[PDB]
Amino acid sequence: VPLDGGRFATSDLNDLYRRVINRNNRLKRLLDLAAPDIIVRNEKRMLQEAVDALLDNGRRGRAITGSNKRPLKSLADMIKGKQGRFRQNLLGKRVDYSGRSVITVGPYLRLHQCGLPKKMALELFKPFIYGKLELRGLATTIKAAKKMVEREEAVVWDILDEVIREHPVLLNRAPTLHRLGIQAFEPVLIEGKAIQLHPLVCAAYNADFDGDQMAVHVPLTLEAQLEARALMMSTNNILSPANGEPIIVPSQDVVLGLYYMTRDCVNAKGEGMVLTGPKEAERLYRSGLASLHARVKVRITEYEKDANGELVAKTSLKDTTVGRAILWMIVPKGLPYSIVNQALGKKAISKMLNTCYRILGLKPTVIFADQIMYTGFAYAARSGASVGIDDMVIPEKKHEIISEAEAEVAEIQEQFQSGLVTAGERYNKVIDIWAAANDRVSKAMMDNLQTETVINRDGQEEKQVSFNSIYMMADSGARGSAAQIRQLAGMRGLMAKPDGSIIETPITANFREGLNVLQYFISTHGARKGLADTALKTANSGYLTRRLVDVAQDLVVTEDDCGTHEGIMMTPVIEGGDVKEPLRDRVLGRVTAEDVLKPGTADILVPRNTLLHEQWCDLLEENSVDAVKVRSVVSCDTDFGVCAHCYGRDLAR
Amino acid sequence: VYSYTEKKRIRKDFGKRPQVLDVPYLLSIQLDSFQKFIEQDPEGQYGLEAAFRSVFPIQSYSGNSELQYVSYRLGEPVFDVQECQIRGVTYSAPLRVKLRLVIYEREAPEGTVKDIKEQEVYMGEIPLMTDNGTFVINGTERVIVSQLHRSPGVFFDSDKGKTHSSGKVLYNARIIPYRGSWLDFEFDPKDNLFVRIDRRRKLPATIILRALNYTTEQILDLFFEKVIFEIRDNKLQMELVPERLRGETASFDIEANGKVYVEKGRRITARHIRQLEKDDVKLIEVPVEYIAGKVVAKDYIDESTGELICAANMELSLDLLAKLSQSGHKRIETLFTNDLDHGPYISETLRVDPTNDRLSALVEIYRMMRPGEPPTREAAESLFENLFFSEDRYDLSAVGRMKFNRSLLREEIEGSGILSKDDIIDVMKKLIDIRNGKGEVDDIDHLGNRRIRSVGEMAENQFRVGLVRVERAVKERLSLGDLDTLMPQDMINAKPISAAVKEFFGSSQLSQFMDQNNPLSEITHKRRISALGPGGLTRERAGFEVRDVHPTHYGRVCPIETPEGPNIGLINSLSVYAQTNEYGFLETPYRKVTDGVVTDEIHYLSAIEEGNYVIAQANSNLDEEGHFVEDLVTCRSKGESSLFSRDQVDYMDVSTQQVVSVGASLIPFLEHDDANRALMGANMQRQAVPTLRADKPLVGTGMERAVAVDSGVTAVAKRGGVVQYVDASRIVIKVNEDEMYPGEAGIDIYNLTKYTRSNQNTCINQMPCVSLGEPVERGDVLADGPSTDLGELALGQNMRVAFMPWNGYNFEDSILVSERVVQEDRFTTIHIQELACVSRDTKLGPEEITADIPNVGEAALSKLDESGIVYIGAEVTGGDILVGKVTPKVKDSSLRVPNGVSGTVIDVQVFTRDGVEKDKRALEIEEMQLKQAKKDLSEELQILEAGLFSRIRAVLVAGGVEAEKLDKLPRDRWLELGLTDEEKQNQLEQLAEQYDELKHEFEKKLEAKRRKITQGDDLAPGVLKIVKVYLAVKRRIQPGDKMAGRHGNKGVISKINPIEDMPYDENGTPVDIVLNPLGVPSRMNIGQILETHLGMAAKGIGDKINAMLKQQQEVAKLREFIQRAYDLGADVRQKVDLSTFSDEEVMRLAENLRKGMPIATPVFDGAKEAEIKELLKLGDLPTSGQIRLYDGRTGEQFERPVTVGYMYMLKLNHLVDDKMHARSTGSYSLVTQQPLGGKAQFGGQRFGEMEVWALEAYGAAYTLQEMLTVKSDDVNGRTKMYKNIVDGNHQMEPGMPESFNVLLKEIRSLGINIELEDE
RNA sequence: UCAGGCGAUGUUU
DNA sequence: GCAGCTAGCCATGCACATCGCCTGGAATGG
DNA sequence: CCATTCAGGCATGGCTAGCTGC
Ligand SMILES: [Mg+2]
Ligand SMILES: [Zn+2]
After folding, report:
1. CA distance to partner chain A, nearest, from residue B636 (Å)
2. Which residue among A93, A128, A488 sits closest to B1081, beta carbon to beta carbon?
3. Angle formed by the axes of helices B455-479 and B48-55, to 10°?
4. Labelling B777: which of A118, A164, A644, B700 has CA 20 to 30 A away?
5. Which of B260, B253, B292 is closest to B276 using CA atoms?
6. Which of the nucleotides lies closest to A530 (Cα–C1')?
7. Which residues does the record give as Mg(2+) binding sites (chain A)?
């Protein structure tokens, strides 16, 4: 390598061969004059040492250093190791036609398309642009065309649009855990220099917008374009191959939006009136003549498909809330109603989307997802849920509780001072008393928040669930939990110790009031412990994943049906406590082995070679089934593969 | 009372705890250490002196030739700081040393012959430290972090746990000197005591014991204790210290005075012992069987024939009893044992012993030290003598000796730097004692055992290495010296010394490239404390333990500031008040407690010293007279807090800040946030960028002033005085006579570093902030540096923000930013880049810099002068040419703008090795700088003389005043004006002599400077000229640049909305930034909300004032109002008596408030809710801190009252235009035909192993096939792909990966043979 | 165009 | 016993993707 | 400068030499 000037950064390989050759030649020379045996032996020794080094430095005693201190890099080096060829240029490698930048939000896209910066596109598609150019003859030769692009003249942008119009790209994020970590999209040309990505797929990428970077690749071969559009465009991953549940579950902003858009007040504008149609419902809410949310009777209409795949109309009156109806306006035809009648928490809307899918196919579900997002942001911003200090309500009896605990601890202290008890059980008494006090505190604060709302009703007074912003953000399921809002309002209680055991004097003060020094000092190492543990945990997990893939690599579903009669007996699992997994979810999606009979004997219920989807599973729950012998990959009788019917539903489809 | 400058903008201050000890200087570490490294100090004591007096004098090989030291001296730099940066050569200073070689006569005692005095021989230069603690190595600005590492001395560790899962614990002990080889003792689970040296192998410690010329009996006598049997007619009377048998049961019968006390099965009891010791007879009855279970102590031999009865280390038996009885030796020496008190460990190891003499001992020693050799006796002798007694190859520090003796409960703290038999033996005794469960192990983590070096230490150690390198050749030539016909400098060689020191500074795990983009960042990255580096440990060989914050970091090492990621708990920052002890430990201040009165006597304490006492926590009220208000109080004693009585206390805290670093003690309201976000916010704050304007953060913490002063990036006047001349370039101050020297009284000038380059390409700059003709006080601000304002630190700006979700545009954490902002240029910031284009003369000929270039555009050429280099001030974009460099073929190698980086060329630099044609533009530039510097020093002398004659006038006023003959005849003709010969006349002569001296020195400095600019400076070998350019981009803000608050609330601006669209208040003002509420209750950084409130309070006071003033209301109203505004609050130490100002002295305060009323907050003592509330109530804004808003889109009313206020946000320096990057088809790596890696190099991304997993996971096949072959490897197929593309035919053809081809070849190089079949 | 060394950045939950 | 056990010694292994910056083989007759 | 030179980990496992049976 010629560096700056007529010098060269030395390569260990060159140095090693050079050493060996010097040694060999001096030796061969000595085999012309018959030096004594001690000489020739020490010489041969040198040479053997040399060759040993060349093949595999280090493996034989102290590695011969190189320039300054380093174990200079040998051939065995150049193969093995985290930087050798196998792991550095064969498994994964660098790639042309690619770019990287910062991502952002842009909530105005349909989720089969993500933004893309204009400069970046132009630079990605230089070839195709040249092509279309000297097709339409606006240019003549390549060199000229290159200069054209350099100029960035007028026609070029139109042509670039033309080549974009249908050609997907792949987006990627670095710590690529699972199959979702790569997806496809269709470009839409944008100013600026950032990538606008549809806000749903953030959850899938596990990628917030706090500066994380994503990379884009471009397919070239026509095969690959089809590959992308048929197997990698986000409109086919709404179900994680991890488990059956969906993955395009909406998240924090939108869930807050819905939760506010559907929740009963008790006495607000526009009450008790009745409304013919969600249409006029929305009309009211925009007019401002009625609450966004107030109990009200309306007429609604729904469609079922109890027929042989054909819809049946019906309609009725319902008792509900304006906003709830307005929500209803969107839902596609074939769905029940009570689904969107309750408070619509996170799990709620998740299950909602799920059932939508597994009754009405795909296209309706996608379009439904997008409508959910739009309406969610709209009404959220309309509401304006904000945090403010006043929200975090310090409880009243907190001081009383903590003083009580103080006194009782002091009494235990006197008891030990009277030598009755021993340090161990003393310690134990104290930890337990603080635990119980903590519980009482948590009860108090959560009570106050959840139920505080108490207002008249055109009658006298009445309590109800609250509109306190923080409790709302919690109960939705958007962010936080009892744990975290507890650390806000009530005392955060107890903290660990460098040993891993626990302190003998808990934190007595929450975050609304400030901590005094020593408390905060403790909390420091409290946090830092996990904060540093996270790296080791990361690494160890990753090593696990690698090892797994390299051992279960070559298993492929090649044959169709081994046609056999084995199986295993799935039963729902219990730990003598309650059932912890219901047979429904443990069996759902796998394939029968021996035809199940009714508990009424000799009354065979399901043929022995069927696949259990929802309706059959529900029939199982009907007839209150015990356990099922079921086909499983562990026992298929294929050769170099695994027969489909022994594997089951392809989750994600 | 406040300084006039302070009066510019006083700051309101909450806070109760009265601060008694002010903040100390923030660079104590750097400056003190280095100032200590370089000084003319007597009596050795840690300097160049120390290293010298160590290494010298060098005596000959008895050739009577002694090379002695005399004295040293450091001259003055050939250059200075400015020109040094400009060129690139280091910033050093000559090293001149007085040595002297004397020669006696042979044949006699010290009969002298001759000496020679090579006065101040040169031995290569060492660098120096600017008065900002920064070095300058090669035009750069590097800094040496201070290292933390294990104190020398000795330690006693558990090694719990992994002990073979036998549930047992081991015990090791380590002696670790400051320079030499280590030493280790440890037990094996079979209770065997072993030593090792530097972790090679294991040997039985008795080996070294015997090695120190000891015998078996010597050793045993020394460790174990004596027990005597005495032969008699019968009953074998034994001697018994009673307490000896306090623990283990005596299975036989024991009587005294006939009276039995103990029998079989009788365990000895406390009353047993008491009555026995009351009896006190130590010649008592014994059986015979029990004795047989012992080990002989000494060595008995036959009565007459003296033949071996029994060697020591031998158990009793029948035959031994018989052969001693036939001797009848009335003395029997044995060694007591007690498994609960006293083990035979040593003697068992003695059993293990292979050898039995000093000689074979040392033999085995060498045989493990260096493997495989016949050991010469005296050779191994000298070797072992050379391990632990070399005055040179081995050394404890004085520090070592101290900590050592202290740990051994010795009495004194001085003596040998090397070991002793007594020392090692005592060590082993301590080890045994702990093995006996008395004496505690000692945790490493305890900062009573970590130690902080610094630059002083580093340079000293390295320099000493250099000297002992030279001394070899020194004594070589000396021993082979001639007859007096030589000279010292003949014998000496600066080459190795300079080599070592340069290697150290310019290349080290410590000496790192100083971050500079932000004043706080500088002053941090100077105080940092790392445990990496030489003589330390590695980024991977440390677990939970050394990372965790031991409970004694308190007040010494900040707990909450540390870079997360790979290395945590390794990059501690040194706390605010922390000081380096005399020895090197970290001591901290405390307040002395008398009987019941808190004296304001500060008092420093180390780590271990703190352990004894008990300390009161800062937040604790008191009755004005050192009386604690309560009588029980929380305190801490020994890693344990509790509540105590009143009389128990010892010492009290200093200030409620002393537990955090400057890296964190700016974060307002820290006391509310969690540690996680506290940390993240601290670092982000460290990464700010200087805006184009500073704007005094509304919500500060009173440390701002301190940091701004202590950094080096602002100008503090060294003497009080009066403004005499302001000018965007310079500032000129007349001094006050009371603080003036008689001679060269004169005045002072401060130049100002104008627009120039950081190490991070940010725009370091300075500005004046004083109007003409104004008083200034000794030690005050004059030149606000980058991101400074009127003397306080200011990083970002304050912005009217509002928490409310909005149409998704703030989905995860995405800030949304109104256009009002980007209009008013309040995040625009400057960047500078340095682009070089060297030129060489190499094979096939020389390069040239003509303006002519083949096959270019005259249009492009238009921006070039006839000399080739662009003018000063063009506006260039990408692709433009800056310098025409040509190659003999002839081919272009011109330097062009990097892609997509606009800007303007602000300055040019040219260098050319001497002996080469200075071309046209070079000459022009040279003459230009010449005129500049001439003007410069000329003006210096001119206005200096102006002031000097003014002072003359001042003098002539008294005594022989002559107004007419004064103001008329030329001021130079003031030698013979009428006045007496008073010392006033003498001082007139003083002024005149300094006049003439200014003249002459001005002359010589002019000349030398001319020659400096005239010469053609050096370069690398093989280069003709170098052309440096400077661009200057003006980055605006735009979608996708990380902004962030001071609480870890990160964010990425995403859409630039038009003024219409931002929500607006009921009164019209829009709101600038919109954050996302959903970000709070998880990242529990609740602080930012309170910050926002208190902000709005401030700005409310503001608008009130601004209205009042635009009303042109009278001053009385303002006095009343502002006075109220400060006087509010429950209780403070602030006290501003606005009734004590002039009417000018106030209106200015108003006009500096009208943007807002800054507010302070000590870290753990700041404001509280009710206080903020009442402040707002003084304002005219609702208590709840929330408002009803309106939506510009619909002009309707949002439903719930939302939160607005002012947050102080920062623009980080991850800028989209540097992250964004792409590639179509660039170069290809040379060894493997793969694309390169990086942005700088026009490389491409890395499609990684996990992505390949991903594609296999989908059914995708063709895609992966492509992205492994066509896009990447095959030369052939790659090109053919490109062709098929441009011809509009999307289709590939595989080929085989060249990389795999390479793998094959490498294996085939190894002895293997891998092939490829063919079916 | 090569290997190091430094920091820094993201993976918080 | 020679069969089996057990202790000690050493081989093997420890996320991914960036972005700056810098700094380099050098020594020794003649 | 051109010819020739040369000092802190942790877990697991797999083995090899003793240790010591019954
Ligand atoms: Mg992130
Ligand atoms: Zn099967």
Report:
1. 9
2. A488
3. 30
4. B700
5. B260
6. C12
7. 208, 210, 212
B1084/A95 CB distance under 8 A = no
Q: Are residues B1021 and B884 in the same domain?
A: yes
Q: Are residues B550 and B600 in the same domain?
A: no
**Are B1130 and B1274 contained in the same domain?**
no
Residue B291, helix vs strand vs coil: helix
Please state whether the peptide bond connecting residue B287 to the residue before it is cis, i.e. omega within 30 degrees of 0. no
Contacts of B1202 (CB under 8 A, 6+ apart): A384, A386, A388, B802, B803, B804, B1186, B1187, B1189
Map B730-763 to HEC letters. Answer: EEEEEECHHHCCCCCCCEEEEECCCCEECCCCEE
* Longest distance between any two alpha carbons in chain A, whole Å: 123
Amino acid, single-letter form, for residue A416: F
Q: Residue B320, exposed/middle/buried by CB under 10 A (0-12, 13-18, 19+)?
A: middle
Instruction: Identify the domain boundary among B322, B342, B362.
Output: B342
Which among B382, B385, B391, B422 is positioned nearest to B404, based on CA atoms?
Answer: B422
CATH of the domain at B734: 2.40.50.100
Q: What is the whole-number distance in angstroms between the Cα of residue B813 and the centre of ligand 1? A: 10
Name the residue among B671, B1196, B1245 with its Cβ closest to that of A100.
B1245
Nearest CA-CA partner of B699 in B791, B767, B795: B795
**Domain of residue A427, residue span:** 389-529
The burial class, CB within 10 Å (0-12 / 13-18 / 19+), for B417 is middle
The Cα-based distances of B1086 to A153, B330, B668, B699, B878 in angstroms read: 52, 86, 12, 16, 46
**How many CB atoms neighbour CB A18 within 10 A?**
11
Is B1307 within 8 Å of chain A by CB?
yes
Do B1100 and B1196 lie in one domain? The reply is yes
CA distance A606 to chain B (A): 32
Torsions phi, psi for A629 (to 5 deg): -80, 130
SS3 of B120-148:
CEECCCEECCCCCCCECCCCCCEEECEEE
CATH number at residue A433: 1.10.132.30
CA of A632 to the centre of ligand 2 (A): 7
- Alpha-carbon gap, residue B899 to B901, rounded angstroms: 6
CA distance B1154 to B1104: 9
What are φ and ψ of residue A166, in 5° steps?
-135, 10
Domain holding B1246, by residue range, is 1234-1319
What was the elucidation method? cryo-EM
CA-wise closest residue to B1030 among B651, B1306, B1305, B755 = B755
Sign of the dihedral defined by the CA atoms of residues A168, A169, A170, A171, in that order: negative
Cα distances from A216 to residues A88, A115, A370, in angstroms, run 21, 11, 24
Q: Is the Cβ of B1104 closer than 8 Å to some Cβ of chain A?
A: no
Q: Residues B1009, B1066: one domain?
A: no
The separation, in Å, between residue B703 CA and nucleotide D11 C1' comes to 56
Distance (Å) from CA A216 to ligand 1 centroid: 18
Three-state secondary structure call for residue B211 = helix
Interatomic separation, CA of residue B189 and C1' of nucleotide D2, rounded (Å): 29
Nucleotide D12: nearest residue by CA–C1'? A81
Q: Give the resolution value in Å.
A: 3.7
Please count the structural domains in chain B. 9
Give the residues across from B1043 on adjacent strands: B1211
Query: How close is the nearest chain A Cα to the Cα of B1249, in Å?
Result: 5
Q: CA of A181: how far to CAs of A110, A201, A252, B700, B1253, in Å?
A: 19, 10, 21, 43, 10
The DSSP secondary structure of B524-562, one letter per residue, reads HHHHBEES-STTS--TTS--HHHHS--TT-TTTB-SS--
Q: Indicate if B211 and B347 belong to the same structural domain.
A: yes
- Residue B189: CB partners within 8 Å, gap ≥ 6? B163, B164, B166, B168, B170
